[PDB]
Amino acid sequence: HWGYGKHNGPEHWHKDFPIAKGERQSPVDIDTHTAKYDPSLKPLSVSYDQATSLRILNNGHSFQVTFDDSQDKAVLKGGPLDGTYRLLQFHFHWGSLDGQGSEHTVDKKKYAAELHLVHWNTKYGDVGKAVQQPDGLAVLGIFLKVGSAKPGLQKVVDVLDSIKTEGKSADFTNFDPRGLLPESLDYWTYPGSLTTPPLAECVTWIVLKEPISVSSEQVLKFRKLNFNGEGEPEELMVDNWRPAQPLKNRQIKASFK
Ligand SMILES: Cc1ccc(NC(=O)NCCS(=O)(=O)Nc2ccc(S(N)(=O)=O)cc2)cc1
Ligand SMILES: [Zn+2]
């Protein structure tokens, strides 16, 4: 089964998921000098005031917080998007060292981690159907750098020892994802894919320019999670990121001058 190790990592994925070598794979390097400002882009509309978080889960490759998406409670709209996209969950990708861990890069710069807020297009009814569509998902990607603590992340980090190993979950209600956002909503956007198997080419990527800063203590608690399940040999959950993929016939657009 797939993972991030030498023997099952991103260079192996194409054998089970041949779309790994497709025409719109993610992540990519964002070359800020080649991305074009697009004045027809709208401001993003991030409407999370009614978000209802449910559980936090170690899924063996990352940790994820799930939300109630049975209703338009936490939606992403505007920007490059048509229609309404409901928040399903967020998760992160991070490194073993502060100089790596993000999936997208900016002029080849790697950040310590990357937050993905995963949304699906309500015109498709459910996420499983959305992932079969070229405009089925919108993932809001936010870079993390190490510096000052992010207060809105602390509740997440404090529960991670209760989901150390694969398959563990915990109640994680009343969490406000607005506390994970940077000040600016300026973004880059491009058509891409899931960055993990099945690597489906169903994602409008919206990557914010402004990183959030997290403390060294916060990211160290990410690095204490385990890929393995309870009672198995401990492999620390670090470097769960896919490297940048060929841009091919795509143009990255910027919402800002
Ligand atoms: C390190 C890591 C992190 C998350 C995962 N998988 C999941 O969370 N799956 C459940 C939600 S899903 O919508 O069904 N699939 C999905 C997969 C990837 C992305 S991404 N990384 O492009 O934003 C977005 C959505 C695997 C490894
Ligand atoms: Zn992700």
Contact criterion met (CB below 8 Å) for 250 and 38: no
The number of residues making up the chain comes to 257
Resolution expressed in Å: 1.6
Least distant ligand from the CA of 89: 1
Amino acid identity for residue 217 in this structure: E
Q: How far is the CA of 85 from the centre of ligand 1 (A)?
A: 16
Neighbours of 142 (CB within 10 A): 24
Q: What are phi and psi of 197, to 5 degrees?
A: -45, 140
CA dihedral 199, 204, 207, 208 (to 10 degrees): -150
C-alpha closest to that of 88 among 77, 78, 74, 109 = 74
Ligand 2 centre distance from Cα of residue 23 (Å): 19
Query: Who contacts 5 (Cβ-Cβ below 8 Å, separation ≥6)?
Result: 235
Q: Are strands 53-58 and 169-171 parallel, antiparallel or unpaired?
A: antiparallel
Strands 203-208 and 187-192: antiparallel
Q: Which residues are annotated as a binding site for Zn(2+)?
A: 91, 93, 116
Look at residue 74 and give its three-state secondary structure.
Answer: coil
Helices (H) and strands (E) in the chain, counts: 4, 15
Number of domains within the chain:
1
Q: Which atom of ligand 1 is nearest to the CA of 128?
A: 14
CA 61 to ligand 1 center in whole angstroms: 9
Q: Please, are residues 23 and 55 in contact by the beta-carbon 8 Å criterion?
A: no
Q: Quote the domain boundaries for residue 204.
A: 1-257
d(CA 161, CA 150): 18
Helical H segments across the chain, by residue range: 13-16, 127-130, 154-159, 216-222
Q: How was this structure determined?
A: X-ray
The distance of Cα 246 from the centroid of its chain, to the nearest Å, equals 19
Q: How open is the CA angle 210-220-111, to the nearest 5 degrees?
A: 30
Q: After which residues is the chain broken (C to N over 2.5 A)?
A: none
| SS3 category, 151 | helix
Residues pairing with 203 in the sheet: 137, 192
Residue 113 to residue 131: CA distance in whole angstroms: 24
Please give all residues whose CB falls under 5 A of ion ligand 2, grouped by chain where several chains appear: 116
Could you tell me if 6 and 84 are in contact, meaning their C-beta atoms sit under 8 angstroms apart? no
Cα–Cα distances in angstroms (integers) from residue 1 to residues 63, 110, 126, in the given order: 18, 27, 26
